[PDB]
Amino acid sequence: LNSINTNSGALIALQNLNSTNAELTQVQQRINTGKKIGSAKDNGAIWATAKNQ
Amino acid sequence: LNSINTNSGALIALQNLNSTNAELTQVQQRINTGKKIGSAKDNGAIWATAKNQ
């Protein structure tokens, strides 16, 4: 409380903002590639069955 | 009592003034560093724990 060296609220706010930027990056990928699973990182099993099909 | 060669009241007054000056110096150090434990002299166990942390 009332510290000058530490600001935990800014840390939690930056964590929530980084989560929002991660969701926005996922939506940007969904928009530009047109696929909900555009790579093995999205879902390896469905992407594997898709490459085989 | 009624001595000219000594003044005990000035001695106790100097002791109280030195205590007040030490408290003001501690408050100045806390205003400076921003830490209530800025060094090992303040509290060595908690200080070493914070250093490892």
Swiss-Prot record, chains A, B:
Domain of life the protein comes from: Bacteria
Coiled-coil stretches: none
Compartmental location: Secreted; Bacterial flagellum
Function: Flagellin is the subunit protein which polymerizes to form the filaments of bacterial flagella.
Homology family: Belongs to the bacterial flagellin family.
Assembly notes: In C.crescentus, the flagellar filament is composed of multiple flagellins of 29 kDa; 27 kDa and 25 kDa.
Protein name: Flagellin FljM
Organism, as annotated: Caulobacter vibrioides (strain ATCC 19089 / CIP 103742 / CB 15)
Top-level taxonomy: Bacteria, Pseudomonadati, Pseudomonadota, Alphaproteobacteria, Caulobacterales
Coverage span on the entire protein: 3 to 55 of 273
